């Protein structure tokens, strides 16, 4: 039918401080239909223990989900969220930028 | 508390 | 504060991969408190907030019975929708429904809602009078006729004005420590050069509840709606929300820009600037 591609934001629960425990979030929203594949990446590799919220939707019927995992940031490690959806030709990767 | 009402299309 | 309760149902068919999945979640304002998933190992209405946990076995059994009955109804509705739109049995389709009640600061019913969609498009909605329907197309008009003949609106009106409001008030009292607490945003402005003659100012709001917030940039006191990048309000995962707004400004003009923040947790709106 008519399909809507996801918006993606990658960010932390608290402001990041190297060595201090935190949570890494990937928030996907604005998409339809509801099937979606979301991975959290640590230096390009898939993190195993990732939880997510219960499927819900906005007043415009588009779906949203929060994927999240505990992490301890360091100066060296790079984090990202990788998303696939029927609307995407290939997986989209959004890198975590502490300031954005 | 959810609605008990049947909504058959 | 004004308060609302909303349930959100999603039924998704998946030909060749079993019966349609049904998921229901319930919210008070921006706080989820229950879920049901027909794909769970043992589908049950389950608590998702600490203040709902005190409800007794009759509550959980009754809600589980209702949501299992709804799952079966929406599986039939997906079959019915295929007929109404002349669609094949090969494709995946989705029905969504959202319903609930809004209370004013008085605590009295402000208005009720019961709206449904098919494949992400409006299908049928209960009008604000809680007695008539708005159907989006000639398929939904068939449903409308059925529901008129079966007096469905009267039943929904009875729920929305009665149990919906009663139980929302009960939740608001049992959960008052959190549901009736607004956490104001923690705010700051960051500055990053784009180049020698432009810089990004980003106004941050963190740690706030409920989600509703207004973040705006002004230049010389005039709103910069078109030039502002505003991200969607996003959940932090600890009940609170986050948002930012950014503008790109000429180097040397940063003090002409102010960020304005409105939130229920604030006594009065905040004005901030970049502090070098």
Numbering used by the authors:
A (entry chain B): 0 to 99
B (entry chain C): 1 to 9
C (entry chain A): 1 to 276
Text lifted from the article:
The human leucocyte antigen (HLA) molecules, encoded by the major histocompatibility complex (MHC) region of the genome, are cell surface glycoproteins responsible for the presentation of both endogenous and exogenously derived peptide antigens for immune surveillance. HLA-B*57:01, HLA-B*57:03 and HLA-B*58:01 are micropolymorphic HLA allotypes of the HLA-B17 serotype. Polymorphism within these allotypes is focussed on regions of the antigen-binding cleft (cleft polymorphisms in comparison to HLA-B*57:01: Asp114Asn and Ser116Tyr in HLA-B*57:03, and Met45Thr, Ala46Glu, Val97Arg and Val103Leu in HLA-B*58:01). Notably, residues 97, 114 and 116 contribute to the E pocket of the antigen-binding cleft, whilst residue 116 also contributes to the F pocket.
